[PDB]
From a paper:
The periplasmic chaperone [name] has been identified as part of an Ag(I) detoxification system in Gram-negative bacteria. Biophysical and biochemical analysis of proteins comprising the sil gene cluster has been limited to date, with sequence homology used to infer function and the proposed resistance mechanism, after comparison with the more extensively studied cus and cue systems. Such analysis is consistent with the model that the [name] is a periplasmic metal-binding chaperone capable of binding both Ag(I) and Cu(I) ions and shuttling them to the SilCBA complex to aid metal ion detoxification. The protein has a β-barrel topology composed of five β-stands arranged in the β1-β2-β3-β5-β4-β1, similar to that observed for Cu(I) chaperone CusF. The X-ray crystal structures show that the metal ion–binding site is formed from strictly conserved residues His63, Trp71, Met74, and Met76 located at one end of the β-barrel.
Cocrystallization of SilF38-120 with either Ag(I) or Cu(I) under anaerobic conditions yields an orthorhombic unit cell with three protein chains per asymmetric unit and each chain with one metal ion bound close to one end of the β-barrel. In both the Ag(I)- and Cu(I)-bound structures, the metal ion is coordinated with distorted tetrahedral geometry through the donor groups NE2 of His63 and the two thiol groups of Met74 and Met76. The Cu(I) coordination geometry within the binding site is noticeably different than that of Ag(I) where the fourth coordination position of the Cu(I) ion is occupied by a water molecule. The Trp71 is now blocked from directly interacting with the metal. Furthermore, the side-chain of Met74 adopts a different rotameric conformer compared to the apo and Ag(I) structures. Such flexibility allows the protein to provide ligands at shorter coordination distances so as to accommodate the smaller ion. By contrast, the conformations of Met76 and His63 remain unchanged between structures. Ag(I) has a dissociation constant (Kd) of 7.6 nM, whereas Cu(I) binds with a Kd of 30 nM: both determined free energies values were within experimental error of each other meaning that the affinity of SilF38-120 for either metal ion are very similar in size. The differing role of water in the two binding mechanisms allows an adaptability of the binding site to accommodate the two different cations with similar affinity.
Author numbering:
A (entry chain A): 11 to 89
B (entry chain D): 11 to 90
Amino acid sequence: MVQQVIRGSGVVKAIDMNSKKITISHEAIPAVGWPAMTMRFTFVNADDAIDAINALKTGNHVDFSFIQQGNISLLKSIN
Amino acid sequence: MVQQVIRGSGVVKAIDMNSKKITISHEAIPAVGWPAMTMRFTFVNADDAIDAINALKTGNHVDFSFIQQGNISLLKSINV
Ligand SMILES: [Cu+2]
Ligand SMILES: [Cu+2]
Ligand SMILES: [Cu+2]
Ligand SMILES: [Cu+2]
């Protein structure tokens, strides 16, 4: 019942420092019937952006958590 | 974006054939930050109520899938 905090991983493919949005090509999440795909997340703390740029440069898989409210995706944490 | 279909397992602890609900003490689902706890699922099909009553008698872990709409949890499958 408490709000879902979804663990994911993927490659960061885009970032927008204006709209405070990040594009991740995420892996499948079979626990909730979700396939691998690419989507945008608005990051819930705006200071989260910095680390993501590193990943964006490197092209490395990263772990992250996020919330899914209807059609919106809010990025909560990233490594 | 496609609708979440959440897989779980647990023990059926109650059923209500009027409100069409089943109470399952489900295991943790770490993928979505959810702990083990007890909650109710609304069912649609009578073969789901049947299987659930079996499980209710036996006390067996069962697998199940469900959708989460606001406060409702709607059962999609259940399997002894
Ligand atoms: Cu990959
Ligand atoms: Cu997605
Ligand atoms: Cu158990
Ligand atoms: Cu629950």
